Structures are given as C-alpha cells and as structure tokens.
Amino acid sequence: FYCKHVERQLCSVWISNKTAWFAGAFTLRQRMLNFVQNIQYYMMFEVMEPTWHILEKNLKSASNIDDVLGHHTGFLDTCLKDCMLTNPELLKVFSKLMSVCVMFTNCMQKFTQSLVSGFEATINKFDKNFSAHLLDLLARLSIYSGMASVISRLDFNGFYTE
Amino acid sequence: KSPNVLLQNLCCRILGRSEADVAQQFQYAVRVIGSNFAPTVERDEFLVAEKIKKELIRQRREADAALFSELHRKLHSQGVLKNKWSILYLLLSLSEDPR
C-alpha cells in the first residue's frame, strides 16, 4: 500500500509539471518510478504467483489437513522473508529511500511560482541522498544471501554497478 | 458594368491610349455595335468549327488544324462560355494569311 501510494505521487509530478525550470528532477523521477514499479514486478511474479500455482497443486494432491496447514504457513513465511518485511535488520535503506521519494514529490508539486534555484538546490540534495541509498541497496542486497533477478530488474544497462 | 462602357474597355485595349485622349474611336464602336444586339444569321458552333478547319487547310497550317481539334474539345471541357459561336466567328473574321 505504501509502494502504491508513492507510485500515485510520482505519476502526479510528471503530469502536472508539463505546462502547455530544470531537467535535474526529470532523471531523478525516472530513477524513482522505475525503481518502485520493478519491486512490484519482482515481488509478485517470482514469489507470489509461482508458489500460489504450486499451492493449487497442493490442494489437489494432499490427503490430509496437517499438510495443507504447513504448505500455507510456508507460503506466508516465504512471502514475508524473501522480501524486506521480517528481514532481521529490515534493510533499513528501503524506508530511507521511500522517505526521500515522499519529500521529493512534495517539493516537486510546488513547481508553481506565483525561487527556481531553491527548488533546484533541494532537488539536487535529494538526488545525492537518493543515489547513494540506491547504490547502498544494491550493495547491501548483493552481500546478503535470487539476487541477480532483482538486480537485473533494477538496472540492466549497468549505468550504476555497485 | 454595362456593355456600352465595356466596349469602351475594348477601345482602351486595342489602342494604347486613355479615354479622354480620344473619343472618336469609341464613337465608331458605339455607331457600329449599336441598333444591333442579336445575331440575325445562322447559329451553329459545329459549322464554324468546320469553317476554321477548312481555313487552316487553305493556309497550310494543317498540323494546327489538328491542334484546333484539341482546342475546341478543351473549350467544351471547361463549358463556362455562354455562346461558343460568337467568339469563334469573331476569331475567324480577323484571320490573317501569313502562309
């Protein structure tokens, strides 16, 4: 739900910002929306749907209830644990990046004038804060023990590789 | 307009002069055109076309006599001229023989 809320914010910025100032936030917004959409594509189409379709094969071929109970518990436990939910240190950089997202969209919605430099400076401050944490996410996930799938989803060109 | 002042235009077009410079020639125009406004002779465009071809054979511009076969067709193709006969008789009447 938090990940959907920020998607709404990020699309709102692009549609309002087009008036019929700067391109510094264009590339920053292109790195935020194409981040959060891909966490959804991964988190669903690798964890949720495969195991759910196998769990429909567990609800045709299993003859008792104490199999089905364990199968269900395993699907829930993996759908948390293979993500950022009950990770032991949570990968706290995700909350920090989402905080930089919500601050960026809040400032970018006030693109209406009636200083362009003050907006440009706070957007670049956010750009440093964001780009550092995106590289920190890629590093912190790469060391943690499936990696290459979400890494290749997040960057494919290798414009950043760390 | 009226045809009487439009004939004065013709008298400015053939000559190279203003209309207050000469009034004699426009008086010749109004004396000949006047008391006649309607042809009292045979009316057919087809006969005057057969009189233009007959005239171009007599002058040995017989390739131009096959041009007139196309130009009369073009004249029919536009179709915005009320009397095709009067201008063909008029253009036939002023014909010179350079041979």
Partner: protein, 65 residues
C-alpha cells in the same frame, strides 16, 4: 470560398485556350483584350459587328500615330 475560386480557375483556362485559337488563326488580339471579348459574348453580341470595330481600331492606332 474554395470552389468559388475553382470556377475562377476554369475561366482563366477558357481565356488561355481561346488565345491558342487566337494565335493559330493569327488575329491581333492579346490576352487582355480577349478577356473583354469573352465578357461581351456572355450578354450576346454580333461578331460581324465587333470584327469591323476591331479591324478599324487596329487601322486607327497607326493613323492616330
């Protein structure tokens, strides 16, 4: 309009094709005069009457010279 100028195209065409007919019979009328000569014929007029006037006006531009 647009078609109301297409009729103006079809009149300039009439005027040009009658000039080709004018040169192959070798008359002295040019384009500007021929545009008067077609206008007169729409009301209807004797070419037998007009030819003598034109054959006098071409005989009165070198005699009034």
């Amino acid at each position: 309009a647009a078609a109301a100028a297409a009729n103006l195209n079809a009149v300039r065409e009439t005027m040009d094709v009658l000039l080709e007919i004018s040169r192959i019979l070798n008359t002295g009328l040019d384009m500007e005069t021929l545009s008067i000569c077609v206008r007169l014929c729409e009301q209807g007029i004797n070419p037998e009457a007009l030819s003598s006037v034109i054959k006098e006006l071409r005989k009165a531009t070198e005699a009034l010279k």
